[PDB]
Amino acid sequence: VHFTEEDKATITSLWGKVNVEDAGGETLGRLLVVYPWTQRFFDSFGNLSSASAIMGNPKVKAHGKKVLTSLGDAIKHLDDLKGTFAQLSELHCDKLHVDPENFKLLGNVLVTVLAIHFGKEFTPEVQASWQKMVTGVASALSSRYH
Amino acid sequence: VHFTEEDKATITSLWGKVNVEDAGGETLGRLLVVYPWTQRFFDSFGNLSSASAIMGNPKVKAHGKKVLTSLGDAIKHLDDLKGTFAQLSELHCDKLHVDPENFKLLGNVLVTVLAIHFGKEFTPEVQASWQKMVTGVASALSSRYH
Amino acid sequence: VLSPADKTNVKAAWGKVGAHAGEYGAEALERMFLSFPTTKTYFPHFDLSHGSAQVKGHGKKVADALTNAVAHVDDMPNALSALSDLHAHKLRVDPVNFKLLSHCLLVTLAAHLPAEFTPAVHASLDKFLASVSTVLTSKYR
Amino acid sequence: VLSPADKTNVKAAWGKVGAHAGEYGAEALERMFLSFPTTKTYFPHFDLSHGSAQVKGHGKKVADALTNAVAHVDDMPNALSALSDLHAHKLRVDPVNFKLLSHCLLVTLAAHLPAEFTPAVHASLDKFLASVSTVLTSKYR
Ligand code: HEM
Ligand code: HEM
Ligand code: HEM
Ligand code: HEM
């Protein structure tokens, strides 16, 4: 990864302000609602048939938290995304066979959720730093494929 | 990197039998014909207004040769594509702003050109080795996008 | 296909843009050019600097087109027929790049209308933009 | 979608395929499973070995649907209606996978009909398969 100095500062700063308990379930729930094929990987989670069903689903909320918690941990070492996600890559690639395009989709949904929460503070420049994070996380998670 | 020895054997062998000049022009020419949005990067190449003009364009042919030569040179070091294409990554990403998804398009077009030239000898197993090459090359070129 | 609720949601959300449709259009383009600089290469005759008047003017055009598409949400291909010919045949835009502008539009709407941008509305808007995109690239819903 | 020249090219090329449509369908699937192994998870209890009778039978289904699409090139949303419902709602096929199968179909055609696979025909066939793919992912929109 080639995060600029500014990118790293922007990502670290904004993350410290994030309501992870809320944005986690928001992010995964929205992914499931907006891109219904992603539900294929979450059979055991129960009723995922609509926005209402998905957004009130306890398992979705709990799992979304874990996803964003993992992102927060990666943010502690932005020069080392590949290492942070190495074991997660083996899980998502070798075991679950998720197409890499979906890592980008989840990241883009997170970006929209950050925009909801931060409003005008989520400037086009701030977004561009987060889009690099999305691409970097996706690449790190895709490492086992190729 | 992800290439098995068999993959390297297959890539190296088939490449030896490729006529680089002809295949280079065919690959870049088809890229421009089949995916016309890619033409916007080649305004200085002269006439690109039709299939015949594109396929008969000398600058297109010459550039295609250059492209395939860099691929052939990379084939010598399949486990270090990232390093081999570091400079080209900077050129395409930071200077030309080529869409990273278009790297895969050129590789896939090359694969179709190999299929035309080798026919039944371009087996599904042989293609699979070559698609690893496409993915590896695209990933290496896209390095400077995150 | 867009559901009755999808249509209600889309009209409601885009209505909430108020006097700022053109501004939001321009913001979406600005976001797209910054995050996805490949898209700048479709605009060689534009000043693409921050706050560019040409970008502001173009954002109003994109907004107007979306406003029309929301108005004729039941017959998208007809409302966008000219723009389809333009993007698919004159400009020859990479179909995959429509996802980029769509994403930047959603981000813009989220940044301005956080109360309105529920998961359901989000889904309705994404479906709407995805269909606008396919109509523009291929005249398919 | 599909110019008159595209229609002509697709009809002529897919006409050369002929008795081998099924064989080519099976080969395209085999190519996809080998090159893009993530796609195998959609076929959990298929025999996916080389020469698989199950894959051969499925190739014929995919080939026949494409043949019907060619026959109804100006009415593809209608022609592929049941298949669009199937691939989105039941199978939940990731849209990205349609590009993968389309590529493997083009490679297959190129391997078997090199002289017919001119740049112009290549372009028309790609547009046709992209149109088929757009329709097959339409129920996500
Ligand atoms: C930025 C992108 C992503 C991140 C950071 C991420 C992170 C994680 C984490 C931390 C776990 C839990 C691992 C554990 O508990 O040990 C997990 C599990 C999982 N992920 Fe993701 N993930 C991402 C994208 C995706 C996508 C796009 C999908 C599907 C379309 C997906 C499907 C799954 C599934 C099915 C599980 C296991 C669920 C279960 O426990 O049954 N992930 N992921
Ligand atoms: C995917 C594998 C690709 C490879 C291996 C490759 C390789 C190369 C090479 C070797 C050069 C010459 C650089 C130099 O002489 O300094 C070059 C230049 C260039 N490439 Fe690529 N390229 C690829 C993809 C693409 C794609 C997909 C596009 C556009 C859609 C593109 C657009 C260009 C342009 C516009 C130039 C410079 C042309 C000029 O000199 O006017 N490349 N590339
Ligand atoms: C929701 C999707 C889109 C909408 C509603 C839209 C709408 C429009 C409109 C209304 C115009 C002005 C047409 C005119 O009166 O001349 C236009 C032009 C144009 N669009 Fe889009 N567009 C969309 C997607 C895109 C994308 C994704 C790109 C490229 C990444 C793009 C590139 C262009 C270009 C290059 C022009 C011509 C600008 C000029 O030369 O003046 N469009 N579009
Ligand atoms: C050119 C694009 C495609 C065409 C024309 C096509 C056509 C078909 C046809 C005709 C069937 C038989 C079902 C019926 O007639 O009721 C089928 C089933 C199926 N397709 Fe496709 N398909 C395409 C793309 C894909 C892709 C990209 C995938 C996944 C990567 C896929 C996965 C499946 C699966 C899992 C089945 C059911 C297999 C079973 O019986 O379990 N299809 N398709």
CATH topology of chain C: Globin-like
Level of helix content of chain A? 55-70%
- State the shape of chain C: globular
The percent of residues in helical segments of chain C reads 55-70%
* Biggest sheet overview of chain C: none
Rg of chain C to the nearest angstrom? Answer: 14 Å
Can you identify the CATH class of chain A?
A: Mainly Alpha
Give me the secondary-structure category of chain A. Answer: mainly alpha
Write out the CATH superfamily name of chain C.
Globins
Return the domain count of chain A. Answer: 1
Tally of contiguous helical segments of chain C: 7
Bound molecules: protoporphyrin IX containing FE
Oligomer: heterotetramer
* Overall spatial form of chain A: globular
The arrangement of helices and strands of chain C along the chain is HHHHHHH
The amount of beta strand of chain C, in percent, is under 5%
Any guess at the CATH architecture of chain A?
A: Orthogonal Bundle
Q: How would you sum up the major sheet of chain A?
A: none
As for the CATH topology of chain A, it is: Globin-like
Q: Count of helices of chain A?
A: 8
Keywords (chains A, B): Acetylation, Disease variant, Heme, Iron, Metal-binding, Oxygen transport, Phosphoprotein, S-nitrosylation, Transport
Domain Globin (chains A, B): 2-146
Function (chains A, B): Gamma chains make up the fetal hemoglobin F, in combination with alpha chains.
Subunit structure (chains A, B): Heterotetramer of two alpha chains and two gamma chains in fetal hemoglobin (Hb F).
